[PDB]
Amino acid sequence: YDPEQANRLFSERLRALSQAHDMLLKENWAGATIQQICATALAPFNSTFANRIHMSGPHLLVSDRVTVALSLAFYELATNAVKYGALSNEKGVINITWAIMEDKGEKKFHMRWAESRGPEVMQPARRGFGQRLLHSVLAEELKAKCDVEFAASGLLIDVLAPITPEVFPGM
Ligand SMILES: Nc1ncnc2c1ncn2[C@@H]1O[C@H](COP(=O)(O)OP(=O)(O)CP(=O)(O)O)[C@@H](O)[C@H]1O
């Protein structure tokens, strides 16, 4: 081991990641709706796994940063769904649902990624740096409380965010 080389490798890999994220940020300058984000990111998966990914929610416009964060989150979640969850078998299904909530006056954005009818989700299922990082980036861009549950019945991700015009333009 050499700590100086380990730090250098981490920076170089981080810079490579930032470069890839800027390519996405430039492309997505106008933002997008959850529907457009969701359908666009999950299009390669809808080809391979027809009628196994379901999306439902109101028409809702989101900023450039959230469109990028959410795209990679959706892509990364589907990548794992094929390797471990609902898309690893033949009967497993993914339900992406979002909506505009109300806490007796305060308007909130809620989103759920729900995997069902997939294989059993075995007890020591613990996230690595990448997914942890993506979830953290997504939650920070949304200024959201994010809950990740590795339920035996299937992975359940919940996002609860306050509505601000920075994150949700024209709101
Ligand atoms: N949709 C899903 N359904 C069931 N288990 C899942 C899952 N997504 C992830 N897991 C579990 O979480 C573990 C950790 O996954 P993660 O992708 O976070 O890190 P990793 O670094 O262990 C593998 P990799 O980075 O190659 O995907 C996986 O090994 C798997 O057991």
Burial class (CB in 10 A: 0-12, 13-18, 19+), 45: buried
C-alpha separations of 30 from 13, 15, 38, 106 in Å: 28, 24, 16, 27
What token pair was written down for 88? 């690893």
Q: Which atom of ligand 1 is nearest to the CA of 85?
A: 3
Domain limits, the chain: 1-29, 31-162
- How many angstroms does the Cα of residue 127 sit away from the middle of ligand 1? 6
Q: Of all atoms in ligand 1, which is nearest to the CA of residue 129? A: 21
CB–CB of 92/119 below 8 Å? yes
| Pair 155, 85: CB distance under 8 Å | yes
Residue 40 CA: distances (Å) to CA of 36, 70, 145, 164: 6, 11, 25, 24
Contact 109, 100 (CB under 8 A): yes
Q: Which long-range contacts (CB under 8 A, 24 or more apart) does 54-59 make?
A: 54/93, 54/94, 54/95, 54/96, 55/96, 55/97, 56/95, 56/96, 56/97, 56/98, 57/96, 57/97, 57/98, 57/99, 57/111, 58/98, 58/99, 58/100, 59/33, 59/35
Q: Provide CATH code, domain 31-162.
A: 3.30.565.10
CB of 130 closer than 6 A to ligand 1? yes
Resolution for this experimental structure (Å):
2.5
- Is the C-beta atom of 35 inside 6 A of ligand 1? no
Residue 5: both structure tokens together: 């080389």
Sign of CA dihedral 3, 4, 9, 11: positive
For residue 157 and ligand 1, the question of a CB distance below 6 A is answered with no
Q: How far apart are CA 10 and CA 27, in angstroms?
A: 26
d(CA 112, CA 14) in angstroms, rounded, equals 29
Of 90, 68, 85, 87, nearest in space to 21 by CA: 68
136 CA distance to ligand 1 middle (Å): 16
DSSP secondary structure of the chain? --HHHHHHHHHHHHHHHHHHHHHHHHHTTT-EEHHHHHHHHTHHHHHHSTT-EEEE----EE-HHHHHHHHHHHHHHHHHHHHTSTTSSSS-EEEEEEEE--BTTB-EEEEEEEEESS----TT----HHHHHHHHHHHHHHT-EEEEEEETTEEEEEEEEE--TTTSS--
